Structures are given as C-alpha cells and as structure tokens.
Amino acid sequence: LWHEMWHEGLEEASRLYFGERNVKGMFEVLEPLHAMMERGPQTLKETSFNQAYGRDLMEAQEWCRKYMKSGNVKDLTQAWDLYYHVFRRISK
Secondary structure, eight states: OHHHHHHHHHHHHHIIIIITOOHHHHHHHHHHHHHHHHHOOOSHHHHHHHHHHHHHHHHHHHHHHHHHHHOOHHHHHHHHHHHHHHHHHHHO
C-alpha cells in the first residue's frame, strides 16, 4: 500500500507541478505521504519500503522545505530528480 500510495501520489503531484504549474497543489499531495513516513512503518512491507526508499524520499522533502524558504524553483528540480528515481524503481 505504501508503494501504491507513493506511485499514485508522485504521479498526481507531478501533474500538478509540471502540468498545472501549481506548487501548492503538489505540496498538498506530498505532505500527507511524507507525514505517514515520519510516523514510521507499521508492517513488514512498509518497513521494506522504508529500507529501499526512505532516505531518498526524506532528501526530496528537505529540498521542498528548502524551496519553502528560498522560493527558488531549482530546489524543486532537485526534489523531482529524487522523486522520479523513487517512482522508476517502484514501477520496476
């Protein structure tokens, strides 16, 4: 379910950012997903997901948090490289 939630969430978040140019909408999708990671995994599958992708997703969040302070779109570009790398691996 974590793999399903992130796969669908990253897709919708990317549509809001790249398609609609809507950063607010992007963050609304991603925030709850990062928040559930912070609370921690509750099952074996969530723990395995966290093992594979947790570090990269946390770094993606830190670049988004950097954007909240800088206003610099470049910081979102860094976030999206990490998010896309995670997205590709979940698809495989």
